[PDB]
Ligand binder design. Structure first.
Ligand SMILES: [Zn+2]
Ligand SMILES: [Zn+2]
Ligand SMILES: [Zn+2]
Ligand SMILES: [Zn+2]
Lengths: 201, 198, 201, 198
DNA sequence: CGGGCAAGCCCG
DNA sequence: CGGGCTTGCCCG
DNA sequence: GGGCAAGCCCG
DNA sequence: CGGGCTTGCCCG
């Protein structure tokens, strides 16, 4: 029943950590992350891997949820859905399991379930927590974002925050991480432009 | 027929004219006589002037229909893009279908036509004589998508075709002009006119 | 009937002219008229004397209609009424003879009629023709304008035209004259400001 | 019936803060900590942050009520100007009373009170505890008239009184700040702060 | 009667 | 985002 | 009205 | 891959 989802980082018991590994320096690169600005820059409907870590294994049945919220207060109350244009296109909605309205999708996990809170009307996607893989330090979830930030009728130029939540079976919060998201035509350019705007302060 | 263009004044000489407009960069609308092109903002009231040599038949009307200019695209029926069609911004008002690009404001006797087989869409109003002492009959048009709209007109130029016609359907007058729906009509006109000079 | 009343001057077969007498130059004169800009500057709810003259007198039961219309196309279709504040206002609707909604009222005539066409919702005011008071060139009608142009919720800040129509006993327009209206606190100030501000274009 | 705007952080250390905000001339809102004063654009989303250390009481709710600052006018109820109340521009589409100055934006549990005897207007929401990991409960307010509006607050300032209450209407906590609803909060703030040194 | 200001708003 | 043009209204 | 934003065109 | 331009929109 939580309208206006919290976005403050909260490592919780197990020290919940969200990080970004690959970095492909380019203007029109499928994606990249600005640590300085705590902002992910990503191409529409492209695969992008995010890295999740814990020190101590979370209780059984724990899940990981991703949910978008608007950064600005005026808009915060507005639910982040896909724009009409992209929603109704056959592109990407042709025989998917994911609803057409959802902005965030998970790539490569069939256990992934798409939540439409019946009261708060909020949209999100959850997957069960998996402990890395024996050689590894990270549980890698791979996400898809299905609309550009600029998309008219949808996000319409308005910034969003992506909130990753480590949760119990019932939904209790164990860990939280948030970061700004921008779905772009060209991540590198838009990143550099914003990073320079920060340098020029 | 789908869809005639060539201008034809006729028995009553049908003239479509535009009054003097703002030169402003974001003026709700403007007309370039040089380029025979109307530049107008999305959803803004855009007045057009109709003139005839002789008082026409009683059961006669004026219809406006959009069609793509370029040879490739004429086939395609021009409607509103999905975003604007479904978005709440102007469709909340009862009067016109949300699909139609061209809308008529201020007239209640606005008939929105969807040809049942050649799915062309257009808007018609009964012709009225100018009010006493007046040269022009003014119709108020609204254009409900930007020319640039993706999944709609998608940056493709279109002509607006104003036809004077009988209840029968006989087309006694035809006039047309290029249309562009944009954010900054003044700017885009100026820019075009400069580039016609090249 | 008409939903766009035309503004176009139409001198009648009976030579219809709408005139203004000498107009006090003071900053906040009850009213003043710019012949240069063909616009009256009237104080809200003040006696504003209009001069009307004709070459040949018209048939009996011929009357004069005054109706406000927004000047610009973007607003043309909006009917010109009094703002909510002033309409429901107690401050000027005691001594009530007129509908509180009507912008334009007439002072001194009790044949003064208020038309509220229910077809096109168009508000106007009508009085029967009086051949100029004896020895006079013209007929003096007193108009009152009941809202400031700037009035919010009403005609807020949007210019208007006033259309005086020389009408036959049953409808037919015999002559028409229009002029811009601005209902302000300081007509003199606003007049000068306009006229001066025009003298470079 | 004057509401007690006298402040007391009672049992739980009841306090209201304002997050950091833009220093723009016409920024939707801004707060001068220096002056006990919130500068707000009309009908814009204005977030208030509430913090408590020990929350318990179950039926507890939070109400916001406007009152005039200067004592002469304190007796006068703070309603919306007739213009804005009767107007179309912000009323149809919501389920909040047209007369009330203060509205709550992101909440359906919000209830808009009309004091049967006092005729005072207020808006109450149930106390929601901060979400896990989170410092404060963040209530979204909007203010529906400019301070300057004639027929309402005739340029005369007001205070906003946020009260933490038991479902009986028992003041657990109270905090208050002066409000100014204007077109240009940044400008008015900057100017106001300056016109405080002497 | 005119000068001046507050506070909304528009245009560059 | 300012800077600067409104305008109703108060002051003297 | 100028300048900036941002999807996508072009070589 | 990046420089650049068009067209919407907001502001060193
Ligand atoms: Zn989209
Ligand atoms: Zn569109
Ligand atoms: Zn008024
Ligand atoms: Zn108000």
């Amino acid at each position: 029943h939580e309208f206006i989802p919290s976005n403050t980082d909260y490592p919780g018991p197990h020290h919940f950590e969200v990080t970004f590994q690959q970095s492909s320096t380019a203007k029109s690169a499928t994606w990249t992350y600005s640590p300085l600005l705590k902002k992910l820059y990503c191409q529409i409907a492209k695969t992008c891997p995010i890295q999740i870590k814990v020190s101590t294994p979370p209780p059984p049945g724990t899940a990981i949820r991703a949910m978008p919220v608007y950064k600005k207060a005026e808009h915060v109350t507005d639910v982040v859905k896909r724009c009409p244009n992209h929603e109704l296109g056959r592109d990407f909605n042709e025989g998917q399991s994911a609803p057409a309205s959802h902005l965030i999708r998970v790539e490569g996990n069939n256990l992934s379930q798409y939540v439409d809170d019946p009261v708060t009307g909020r949209q999100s996607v959850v997957v069960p927590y998996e402990p890395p893989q024996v050689g590894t330090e990270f549980t890698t979830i791979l996400y898809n974002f299905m609309c550009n930030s600029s998309c008219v009728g949808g996000m319409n130029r308005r910034p969003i925050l992506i909130i990753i939540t480590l949760e119990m079976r019932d939904g209790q919060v164990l860990g939280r991480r948030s970061f700004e998201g921008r779905i772009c035509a060209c991540p590198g350019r838009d990143r550099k432009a914003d990073e320079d705007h920060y340098r020029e302060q």
